[PDB]
């Protein structure tokens, strides 16, 4: 009925508002198709390192972007107030709809 996408660059954290959310579901209402991992779109930016000349220097950075699914099948008005008003983790992107 409701599934929540989670994205955030911090791995030791995304699954710790995943757990928090899964927990504030299984304790209230219930169901929840566990929390699903889901491929980590990781960019990469490789840049020239010397301000002038020396194209063999180069720094190589990446930005990992982590996913989490959740999926709650049974939507109890109560389990739908568990997410509401109890949430935080100001650095996870949470998508509620599809």
């Amino acid at each position: 009925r409701i599934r929540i996408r989670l994205k955030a660059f911090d791995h030791r954290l995304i699954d710790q508002a995943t757990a928090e959310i899964v927990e504030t579901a299984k304790r209230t209402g219930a169901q929840v198709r566990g929390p699903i991992p889901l491929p980590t779109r990781k960019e990469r930016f490789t840049v020239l390192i010397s301000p002038h000349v020396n194209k063999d220097a180069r720094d190589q950075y990446e930005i990992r972007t982590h996913l989490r699914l959740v999926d709650i099948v049974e939507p109890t008005e109560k389990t739908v107030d568990a997410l509401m008003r109890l949430d935080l983790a100001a650095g996870v992107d949470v998508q509620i709809s599809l």
């Binding site: 955030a8 660059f9 911090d10 100001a90 650095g91 996870v92 992107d93």
Partner: protein, 206 residues
């Protein structure tokens, strides 16, 4: 040149990040500029307020901004006073609403950046560069600090021809990733030119 920046090589572990928000490409850009626009402005204001760090998080249509300082009261002003007129301009820059925390800095002698700036502002004050490094390194070992080093660069005192000079008292494993190292920069804008400061401070491990 050839030493990997000590803070950045640690981010993944044992070292934070002074911006922590999520954005997607599209806005990722405009936020990044917002950030280096609020720190720019702020650092010019709390200039002589001993601010060592300003963290940023945009919590969904919101910007939080902590200001790790070592003179909380001077930042805060007469009960809530200045923090307000900051809030104002900060929300009046980021283009969204601005809350604003003011974390305090104990044992600032231990703070890389505040250290550097100290030496940095002492050079513009016109004091012996030898003496000022020696002070740094001391009050630091003084209050703990398993190590520290501080070098300064060029025109040191004035010389037509430019030098450096470090001062490694204690432990500093810049190869040991676990090692807690608070590293930083500060440039002093003297009348004979510009001297660059770099302080490493070895706090711990694990």
């Amino acid at each position: 040149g050839q030493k990997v920046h000590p803070n950045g090589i640690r981010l993944g572990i044992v070292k934070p990040w002074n911006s922590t928000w999520f954005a997607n490409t599209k806005e990722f850009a405009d936020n990044l500029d917002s950030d280096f626009k609020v720190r720019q402005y702020l650092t010019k204001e709390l200039a002589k307020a001993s601010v060592s760090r300003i963290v940023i998080e945009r919590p969904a249509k919101s910007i939080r901004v902590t200001i790790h300082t070592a003179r909380p009261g001077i930042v805060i002003g007469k009960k809530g006073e200045d923090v307000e007129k900051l809030r104002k301009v900060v929300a009046d820059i980021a283009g969204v609403p601005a809350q604003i925390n003011i974390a305090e800095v104990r044992k600032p002698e231990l703070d890389a950046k505040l250290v550097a700036d100290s030496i940095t502002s002492q050079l513009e004050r016109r004091v012996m560069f030898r003496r000022a490094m020696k002070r740094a390194v001391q009050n630091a070992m003084r209050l703990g600090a398993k190590g520290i080093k501080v070098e300064v660069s060029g025109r040191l005192g004035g010389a037509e021809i430019a030098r450096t000079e470090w001062y490694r008292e204690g432990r500093v494993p810049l190869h040991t990733l676990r090692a807690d190292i608070d590293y930083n920069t500060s440039e002093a804008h003297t009348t004979y030119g510009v001297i660059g400061v770099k302080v490493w401070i070895f706090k711990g491990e694990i």
